[PDB]
Write a protein that binds this DNA or RNA. Structure first.
Ligand SMILES: [Zn+2]
Lengths: 60, 102, 206, 84, 131, 97, 157
RNA sequence: GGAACCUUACCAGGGCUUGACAUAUAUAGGAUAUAGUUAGAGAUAAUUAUUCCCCGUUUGGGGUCUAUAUACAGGUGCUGCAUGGUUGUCGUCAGCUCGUGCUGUGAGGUGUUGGGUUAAGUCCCGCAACGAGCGCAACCCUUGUUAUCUGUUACCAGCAUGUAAUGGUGGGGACUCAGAUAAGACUGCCGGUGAUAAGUCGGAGGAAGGUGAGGAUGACGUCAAAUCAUCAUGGCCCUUAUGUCCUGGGCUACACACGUGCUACAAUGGCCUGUACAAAGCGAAGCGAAACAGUGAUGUGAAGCAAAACGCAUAAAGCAGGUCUCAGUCCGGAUUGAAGUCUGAAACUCGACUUCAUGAAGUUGGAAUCGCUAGUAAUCGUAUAUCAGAAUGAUACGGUGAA
């Protein structure tokens, strides 16, 4: 996303309540996932390609 | 009960190589001549994720994935220093991981 | 937006992840992201030299040792000068990570039994104003005669630079996408051009 | 509605500005941004202009204002009494 | 290790599992170390549960023990019914035909569905209201 | 019911708004007592206007009309005329006895 | 369109008080909210109250007859031929007979004025037993409405 | 898949301009460092502690950032009718085409127009068609039976037994169970019917019968359908600006109109007391127990636990009793007043929850309209994702359970 926003998310805020998680691959501010530290779209693309080990399609 | 036991938990994503490592370890310890308690299968841990499909409004349509973790357990009776040293020395294919408690 | 990704369909059935390692909850995200960093850095540093690599696949046996295998069909060119490019990778990677990277090169035996290689070839050709229909027909014929049991190619975008976008597809043989026990290789590539961007998709049944 | 164990909230810069005004006989107006500061009983009888995002709205503070917050008396959006 | 329980069986229902133990006796029923009547408070469900015995005219001469968990009250009643049926089968081949006639050997594989995305429930969908 | 005129990426001159109203009084002699809602969406997207009219009937019928044009007055004339004609056609469908 | 529906469950012939399917079906029709135990208790208590308001030992008998006093014979089904809708009479089937009866008693009892649960329903049940009340009124209304329009009886397709 | 700050693209204000961030070109000695000061709303600048460090035994060196001059950066600014990628939709509807041959001057047609049959272009026969491909189905994953292998952290039958509450303890592989490997259901078999067919209606065996149930899987194409605001991207556009650092406001504004949900209007109920039965999940700055204080929200404490080991967590409808009497009510709990709880620096605009009082609309709702064929509707709770805190939404789990 906005590279400056990515860098500010990476940096240390004045306190943690000032900082929000971002997909550091694409910097999307939201749709985040803690287990993978990236957004829903990046997660879907790369898991679909199989670049995320252990993550396959779910039949339920 | 027992003087002490070595509790070793095998964690993997892949059943095949997890199993392979399991028999590798059981053969490696029976080579050292120690009594063994059976490789005992722990429940598989399934983490399901549901994500949107379209990069925009379409909400009724989604897609589901899992992460599956498969776990086995080995118990070793009458711990031996050489036995523990050999267990730590064993090399191991990637994708199957080991946790050891004395 | 139909046509689920065939690789995703076939994972855990007859395919495997492009990264061989497992770790617990504590290390998973960090190691995952370092793998992503490895790919993006290698591919930046190489597609600076325009190189077309089939895959970059990782093996992590150890929490601090990593084996990066670049798989490609022009291994010597990819190597560069006496592995100086190999170490040009490795030094840069350790300039940001604290692990031991050993890089190996996996040689591709059959360049047209690899959908990704086919796709990269198509994309490079159309990047030099080669006529799309002729390129597609030639590639289809070549790879179909080499021994593949079925092949399908679809390109889309501003073909020949017209205002209106279009998609063109060719195919023959068996391409059974809905079959799960099928061994379907899927490759995607993408051409930047003076008129815009052109997508290339390749399905190949074995 | 903070806990008692936390006590009232006053920003530190505003608080020593209040002490300086308390030690000064001159009743100068204080311009502030911290709308979240509670009116501590000590700072009764002052004049504060609080920023409502556009302009500094002034107030004389009386005793009965105590316990409120500064933003409570600086309207932030204006309605002309008609929806046309 | 007396093995006084002459035969043993298992039974399942919606999400409940029960283990049944046949012993010699006057027909008393012990469930989870509690009285059968006090445990299954609904006389309807108790008749539900004891139906296999009344059909196989064997109540009052075999005592029953039940270890049951999972499911709700109705599910547990069905599970113990199935367990009794299987235990009687394990005892005697003679009751097979009558039990199968009443359907006591084929168990209710019917289970609760799963919720589906885009649906409020397994089958209910969100309101359309087209006008 | 009374008609709901919505607009996207455009600003309503009062001239064109009461133009729309003046074209819509054709309904409240014949059709109003038969419909649930009448929506008229104007959009301005490709240096052109796109109009979507929509009507619901009391007997379960739904009428939709989409048009493009260059000049708002002409587009409204054509689209409202088409809408009124299709509504009349459906009313006659049902009343044919 | 693809007719010959799968065989109904039919296996619930309530093995609780009477080994009778009709009581079970009535309780099921009684149900609100998914509360079978509440329905069963209400129905049992109400029929007991009826059997001692009429003071007979056999409750099955009086319950069944008060049902059969409401089970109808010929009902009205609407078809249409040539743009003309006709309310042709047609003979109901037995299952639909119990259904219509139970529905009518239940609706009348629920919508009546009463103090309590089995109170309302027992009162309605004996009114039906005596062939009077809202339920019997509705039944006879359907009967002779169908009969008042017997001309179209040759449309039974 | 979280608007109190950040988020945030808007607004009123204050700074910065090789920039908040990069890579590479040559200078000349530390970076920002840790903790504070001066003013400040903070960003900020001046500052104080301090340095060209490390590999070499130091200079020269290998690279490193200051701090400069640039190549350059940057943009959530326009165009989805310049595009890739992704997605909805007709539609899990059963269709959509090709090679050769034949046929028509030709656009084309046949195959794929016939009679049967199926959920299906599913299958059989015949037919200038012969074959094939993408679809259908099958192969896959859950669940439904059995067999072998293993019994801890799981399980407990026959034993003893800890007063409990806990398989708790010694014990035990019997069972459940967990998870690997296999068997099993294929119209397989039987009867009738059907063109000796394909198919079709019942029957036997069997946990499962005619696709067992559910999910995954969405053909050629259509709507210039959605997205430049996730990324990528052609053209255009700004370059102390439309960029960027922070303070506050705002996205939470109202005479109004429409859509999606929750709670009700009450007797298959409200309230009070006692008692019973689940599954799936989650825990590392996180779970946080036993107990005590407190009507309560919660508070002190720390056991145990990177967890089928402990914790969230004594599920709720239900059942057994007392009470209410058709009353705008012991129904309804919106609205406001007073005092509290937790989160974090901060919750006035603009958080959740609790205690006490306040007790409105609302009497099953017109035209019109939606969902659902079985563990389904209907209803009752539980868990998760985002998250410091905050769900009636969303995802998932079980209980009761029809017509
Ligand atoms: Zn992302």
């Amino acid at each position: 996303a906005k590279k400056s926003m990515i860098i500010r998310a990476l940096r240390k805020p004045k306190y943690k309540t000032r900082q929000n998680n971002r997909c550091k691959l694409c910097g999307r501010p939201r749709g985040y996932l803690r287990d993978f530290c990236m957004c829903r779209i990046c997660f879907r693309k790369y898991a679909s390609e199989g670049l995320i080990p252990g993550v396959s399609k779910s039949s339920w | 009960i027992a003087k002490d036991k070595i509790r070793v938990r095998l964690f993997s994503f892949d059943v095949k190589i997890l199993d392979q490592s399991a028999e590798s370890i059981v053969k490696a310890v029976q080579k050292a001549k120690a009594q063994i308690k059976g490789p005992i299968p722990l429940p598989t841990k399934i983490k399901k994720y549901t994500v949107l499909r379209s990069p925009h409004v379409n909400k009724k349509s989604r897609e589901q994935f899992e992460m599956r973790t498969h776990k086995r357990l080995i118990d070793i009776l009458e711990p031996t220093s050489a036995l523990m040293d050999s267990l730590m020395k064993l090399e191991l294919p990637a994708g199957v991981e080991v946790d050891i408690k004395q | 937006g139909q046509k689920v990704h065939p690789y995703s369909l076939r994972v855990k059935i007859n395919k495997d992840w492009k990264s061989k390692w497992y770790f617990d909850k504590k290390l998973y995200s960090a190691i995952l992201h370092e793998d992503f960093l490895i790919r993006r850095e290698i591919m930046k540093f190489l597609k600076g030299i325009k190189f077309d690599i089939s895959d970059i696949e990782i093996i992590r046996n150890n929490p601090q040792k990593v084996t990066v295998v670049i798989v490609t069909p022009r291994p010597g060119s990819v190597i560069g000068l006496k592995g100086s490019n190999l170490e040009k990778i490795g030094q840069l990677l350790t300039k940001k990570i604290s692990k031991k990277i050993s890089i190996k090169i996996k040689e591709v035996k059959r360049p047209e039994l690899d959908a990704q290689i086919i796709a990269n070839g198509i994309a490079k050709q159309v990047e030099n104003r080669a006529s799309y229909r002729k390129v597609l027909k030639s590639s289809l014929s070549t790879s179909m005669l080499k021994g593949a049991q079925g092949l399908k190619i679809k390109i889309a975008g501003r073909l020949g630079g017209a205002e209106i976008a279009r998609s063109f597809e060719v195919k023959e043989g068996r391409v059974p996408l809905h079959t799960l026990r099928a061994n379907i290789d899927y490759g995607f590539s993408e051409a930047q051009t003076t008129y815009g961007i052109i997508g290339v998709k390749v399905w190949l049944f074995k | 509605a903070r806990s008692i164990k936390k006590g009232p909230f006053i920003e530190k810069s505003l608080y020593q500005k209040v002490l300086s005004s308390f030690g000064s006989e001159k009743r100068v107006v204080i311009k502030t941004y911290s709308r979240s500061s509670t009116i501590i009983p000590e700072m009764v009888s002052l004049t504060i202009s609080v920023y409502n995002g556009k302009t500094f709205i002034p107030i004389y503070i009386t005793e009965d204002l105590v316990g409120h917050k500064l933003g409570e008396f600086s309207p932030t959006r204006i309605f002309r009494g008609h929806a046309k | 290790f007396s093995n006084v329980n002459l035969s043993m069986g298992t039974g399942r229902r919606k999400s409940s599992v029960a283990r049944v133990y046949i012993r010699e006796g006057s027909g008393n029923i012990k469930v989870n170390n509690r009285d059968f009547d006090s445990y299954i408070q609904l006389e309807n469900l108790r008749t539900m549960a004891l139906s296999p015995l009344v059909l196989t005219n064997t109540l009052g001469k075999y005592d029953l023990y039940i270890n049951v968990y999972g499911g709700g009250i109705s599910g547990q009643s069905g599970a113990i019914r199935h367990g009794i049926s299987r235990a009687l089968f394990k005892l005697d081949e003679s009751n097979k035909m009558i039990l199968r006639s009443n359907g006591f050997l084929t168990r209710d594989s019917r289970k609760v569905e799963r919720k589906k995305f885009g649906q409020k429930k397994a089958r209910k969908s969100f309101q359309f209201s087209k006008r | 019911m009374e008609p709901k005129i919505q607009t996207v990426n455009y600003s309503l001159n009062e001239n064109e708004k009461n133009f729309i109203l003046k074209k819509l009084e054709k309904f409240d002699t014949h059709i109003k007592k038969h419909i649930d809602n009448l929506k008229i969406t104007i959009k301005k997207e490709h240096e052109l206007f796109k109009l979507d009219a929509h009507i619901h009937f009391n007997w379960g019928k739904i009428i939709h009309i989409r048009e493009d044009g260059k000049i708002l007055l002409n587009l409204i004339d054509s689209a409202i005329a088409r809408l009124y004609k299709t509504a009349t056609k459906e009313k006659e469908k049902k009343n044919n006895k | 369109m693809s007719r010959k529906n799968k065989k109904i469950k039919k296996k619930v012939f309530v093995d609780t008080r009477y080994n009778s399917r009709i009581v079970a079906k009535f309780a099921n029709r009684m149900m609100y909210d998914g509360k079978k135990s509440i329905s069963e208790s209400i129905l049992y208590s109400s029929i007991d109250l009826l059997a001692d308001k009429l003071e007979e030992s056999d409750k099955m008998a009086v319950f069944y007859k008060a049902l059969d006093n409401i089970k109808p014979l010929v009902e009205v089904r609407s078809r249409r031929v040539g743009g003309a809708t006709y309310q042709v009479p047609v003979e109901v089937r037995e299952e639909r007979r119990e259904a219509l009866a139970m529905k009518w008693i239940i609706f009348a009892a629920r919508k009546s004025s009463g103090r309590s649960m089995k109170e309302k329903l027992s009162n309605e049940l004996l009114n039906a037993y005596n062939s009077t009340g809202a339920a019997f009124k509705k039944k006879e209304d359907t009967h002779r409405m169908a009969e008042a329009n017997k001309a179209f009886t040759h449309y039974r397709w």
